[PDB]
Amino acid sequence: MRERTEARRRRIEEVLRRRQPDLTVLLENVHKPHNLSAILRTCDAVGVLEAHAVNPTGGVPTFNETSGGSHKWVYLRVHPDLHEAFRFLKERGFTVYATALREDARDFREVDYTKPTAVLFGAEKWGVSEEALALADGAIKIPMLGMVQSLNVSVAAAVILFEAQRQRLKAGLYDRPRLDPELYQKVLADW
Amino acid sequence: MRERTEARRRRIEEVLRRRQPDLTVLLENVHKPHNLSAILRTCDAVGVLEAHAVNPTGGVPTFNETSGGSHKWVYLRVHPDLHEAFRFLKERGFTVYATALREDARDFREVDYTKPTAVLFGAEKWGVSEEALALADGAIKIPMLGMVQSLNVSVAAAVILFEAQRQRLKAGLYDRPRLDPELYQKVLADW
Numbered sequence: 001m002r003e004r005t006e007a008r009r010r011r012i013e014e015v016l017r018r019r020q021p022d023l024t025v026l027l028e029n030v031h032k033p034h035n036l037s038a039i040l041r042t043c044d045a046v047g048v049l050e051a052h053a054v055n056p057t058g059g060v061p062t063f064n065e066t067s068g069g070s071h072k073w074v075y076l077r078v079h080p081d082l083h084e085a086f087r088f089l090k091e092r093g094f095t096v097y098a099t100a101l102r103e104d105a106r107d108f109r110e111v112d113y114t115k116p117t118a119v120l121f122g123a124e125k126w127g128v129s130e131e132a133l134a135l136a137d138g139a140i141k142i143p144m145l146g147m148v149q150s151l152n153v154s155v156a157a158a159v160i161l162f163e164a165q166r167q168r169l170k171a172g173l174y175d176r177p178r179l180d181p182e183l184y185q186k187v188l189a190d191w
Numbered sequence: 192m193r194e195r196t197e198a199r200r201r202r203i204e205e206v207l208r209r210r211q212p213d214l215t216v217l218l219e220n221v222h223k224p225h226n227l228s229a230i231l232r233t234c235d236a237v238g239v240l241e242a243h244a245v246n247p248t249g250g251v252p253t254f255n256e257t258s259g260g261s262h263k264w265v266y267l268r269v270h271p272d273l274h275e276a277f278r279f280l281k282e283r284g285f286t287v288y289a290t291a292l293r294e295d296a297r298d299f300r301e302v303d304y305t306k307p308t309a310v311l312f313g314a315e316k317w318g319v320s321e322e323a324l325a326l327a328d329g330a331i332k333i334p335m336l337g338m339v340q341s342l343n344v345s346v347a348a349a350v351i352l353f354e355a356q357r358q359r360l361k362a363g364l365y366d367r368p369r370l371d372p373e374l375y376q377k378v379l380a381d382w
C-alpha cells in the first residue's frame with residue numbers, strides 16, 4: 001500500500017512539481033534517433049514538460065540510444081511545419097531563440113532563461129534553416145574556443161538547457177509548482 | 192602566400208594559444224563511437240589539449256559520429272588500465288573528480304575548475320567503476336530534476352566542461368597562452 005503510494009506516487013508528484021511549462025526546445029530536422037533521445041533525456045533533467053519538433057528523425061519520432069525511457073516522461077509535439085510550430089509557441093508567450101554558428105549571435109549565457117523561452121536547434125549536418133532564423137526572435141551561440149566550428153546538437157542543447165536550469169534554480173522557479181491544477185492533475189494521471 | 196600564413200597559420204596559433212594543458216577528462220570504458228567523438232569535439236571547444244581513456248570504444252579509439260574531425264585536434268592518450276591513468280594524472284598535479292549518480296556527490300558547480308582538473312566519466316550502461324570511485328579525489332554530480340536517473344555521458348561531459356569553460360573565461364585563463372614554448376611549438380607543428 002505505501003509502496004504503491006509512499007513511493008511511486010510521492011516521487012512522481014515530487015518531479016511533476018518541478019516541471020516548467022514555459023521552458024522548451026524546438027528541434028528542426030534533427031535526424032539521428034540518438035540525438036533526439038539524448039535531448040529529451042536532457043529536457044527531463046531540467047524539468048521541460050513538453051518539447052517540440054518539425055520533421056524529427058525522418059518524420060516520425062524515433063528513439064533508441066538514450067532515454068531512461070525519457071520519451072516516457074517528456075511530451076513531444078510534432079508540428080506540420082516551422083510556421084505552425086512558431087505560431088504555437090508565440091501564441092503561448094514564448095520568446096524563441098535560434099541557435100546559430102554565426103559570429104553575430106548573442107552569447108548564450110547573456111539570455112535570461114527564467115522568462116518563457118523556447119530554444120530552436122537545427123539539423124546535424126547543416127544547422128538551423130534560413131527560414132527558422134527569420135522567424136526567431138534572436139540567435140544565440142555557445143563560445144567555441146578550439147578548431148572545430150560546432151558542437152554535437154544534443155551537446156549544444158544540454159549546454160544551453162543546463163544554463164537555463166542553473167538560472168531557474170537560483171531564481172527559485174523549481175521551489176514551487178508551476179502547472180495549473182488541471183494540467184498538473186492531468187500529467188499526474190499519465191505518469 | 193598570405194592565404195598560407197595570414198589564414199591557416201594565424202587561426203591555428205590563435206586556437207593553440209587558448210589550449211589548457213591542465214584541464215582534461217578521463218573516459219572509463221566509454222563504448223560508443225558517437226559518445227567518444229562528441230566528447231572529443233566538446234574537449235576541443237573548451238580548449239582541452241589532451242584527453243585520456245581506458246578501454247575506449249572496445250579497446251581502440253573509434254570515431255564516427257561527431258568530430259569536426261575533432262580527433263584531428265584533440266590528443267587522446269589511452270592507458271593500459273585505471274591505475275596507470277591515475278598515476279599519470281596525479282604525477283602531473285591534477286585533482287581528479289569522478290562523476291557519480293550517488294546522492295552524496297558534490298554539486299558539479301561547486302568545484303573550482305580553474306585549478307588543474309581532470310573529470311572522470313564512466314560506461315554508458317553502468318557508470319564509473321567502484322575502482323575508479325576509490326581512486327578519485329572526490330565525486331561530483333549534475334542535478335537531475337526529472338524522472339530519469341542519468342544523462343547521456345557525452346551530455347554530462349559537456350555540462351561539466353562548459354561550466355569549466357565559463358569559470359576559466361571569467362578567471363581570464365584563455366586570455367594568454369598557457370603552454371610552455373616547447374610544447375607549444377610542438378603542437379603548432381602537427382596542426
Ligand SMILES: C[S@@+](CC[C@H](N)C(=O)[O-])CC1O[C@@H](n2cnc3c(N)ncnc32)[C@H](O)[C@@H]1O
Nearest residue numbers: 099121122124125126127141142150151153156
Ligand atoms: C552540427 S551543428 C550545426 C551544423 C551546421 N552544418 C553548421 O556547420 O552550421 C547542429 C546543430 O548544432 C547546434 N549548435 C552546435 N554548436 C553550437 C554552438 N556552439 N552554439 C549554439 N548552437 C550550436 C545547432 O543548434 C544545431 O542543432
Ligand SMILES: C[S@@+](CC[C@H](N)C(=O)[O-])CC1O[C@@H](n2cnc3c(N)ncnc32)[C@H](O)[C@@H]1O
Nearest residue numbers: 290312313315316317318332333341342344347
Ligand atoms: C548512463 S550514465 C551512468 C549510468 C549508470 N548505469 C548508472 O545508472 O549510474 C554515463 C555516464 O553518465 C555520467 N553522468 C550521467 N549523468 C550524470 C549526472 N547527472 N551527473 C554526473 N555525471 C553524470 C557518468 O559520468 C558516466 O560516464
